């Protein structure tokens, strides 16, 4: 009667056959999309007349609608494109990072995070200007220089897959140059999302919490280790796992730049390395919840 069970462990063929029919689809999808990519996406962002040092100056000079604008925070830096938010809290916000859909891969090396990547904005169809922001990470160099022009406040917003929004304001925010590994630093916290950057994640007692503080942390990309998790094992690096370019510290309490998990809820047995990568803000929605919308914008604070 030991041959009524092995006969039964036939559900092994059943499964194994499903996993060979799946690999079928996945192989076809990857080929389809690969064709789709023989042709790129295009935008025609006709530049707005008005301009300034940053968005605060532009809202003041009459730039009332949120869209792509050209800025030159210095007579020695080539004017660059950027998306300005003129509506959220008195406007004048210079968008530094943005997540809304899953259009852009944020898992990049040190250089791309230096120069910037993604789409600043796209056309509002019918309109000949890009009033809609894309997903991007304005270079680290540009974000550093921008915060070192004088006092600068940082606004971090996010929304879950149901509609709820929460903020995180830091009345003080600076970012050193590349020689100082773009070290971050913030202060003066408000918002209703939880001071993750400063007090680590509010849901873990002891050393476990302090090790999740970004404030004062260097910047790291999977190809450049500057996190606060000392280990000679090349596979154990906050950026490698967790999947973003960020001020990791063994590792995080906040993880914008994380993987865009559609739907919101996701689990360890879904993550590449089994960690909580994904657009995450722990002090608000846990560790296994990737935000639908998550952004980072700045202003001079004047």
């Amino acid at each position: 009667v030991n041959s009524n069970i092995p006969t039964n462990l036939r559900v092994l063929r059943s499964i194994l056959e499903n996993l060979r029919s799946k690999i079928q689809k996945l192989e076809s999808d990857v080929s389809a999309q690969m064709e789709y990519c023989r042709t790129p996406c295009t935008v025609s962002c006709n530049i707005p007349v008005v301009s300034g040092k940053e968005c605060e100056e532009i809202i003041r000079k009459g730039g009332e609608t949120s869209e792509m604008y050209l800025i030159q925070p210095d007579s020695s830096v080539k004017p660059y494109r950027v998306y300005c938010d003129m509506n959220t809290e008195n406007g004048g916000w210079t968008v530094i990072q943005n997540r809304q859909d899953g259009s852009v891969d944020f898992g990049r090396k040190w250089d791309p995070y230096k120069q910037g990547f993604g789409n600043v904005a796209t056309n509002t169809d019918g309109k000949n200007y890009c009033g809609l922001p894309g997903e991007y990470w304005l270079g680290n160099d540009k974000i550093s220089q921008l915060t070192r022009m004088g006092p600068t406040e940082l606004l971090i917003e996010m929304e879950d897959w149901k509609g709820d929004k929460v903020k995180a304001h830091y009345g003080g925010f600076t970012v050193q140059n590349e020689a100082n590994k773009y070290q971050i630093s913030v202060n003066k916290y408000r918002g209703t999302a939880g001071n993750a950057l400063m007090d680590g994640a509010s849901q873990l007692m002891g050393e476990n919490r302090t090790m999740t503080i970004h404030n004062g942390m260097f910047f790291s990309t999977y190809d450049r280790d500057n996190d606060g998790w000392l280990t000679s094992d090349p596979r154990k690096q906050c950026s490698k796992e967790d999947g973003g370019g960020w001020w990791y510290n063994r590792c995080h309490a906040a993880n914008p730049n994380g993987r865009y998990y559609w739907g919101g809820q996701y689990t360890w047995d879904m993550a590449k390395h089994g960690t909580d990568d994904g657009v995450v803000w722990m002090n608000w929605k846990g560790s296994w919840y990737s935000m639908r919308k998550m952004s980072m914008k700045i202003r001079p604070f004047f």
Binding site: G200, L204, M211, T212, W229, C251
Partner: peptide
Amino acid sequence: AHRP
């Protein structure tokens, strides 16, 4: 998150 954090790392044990």
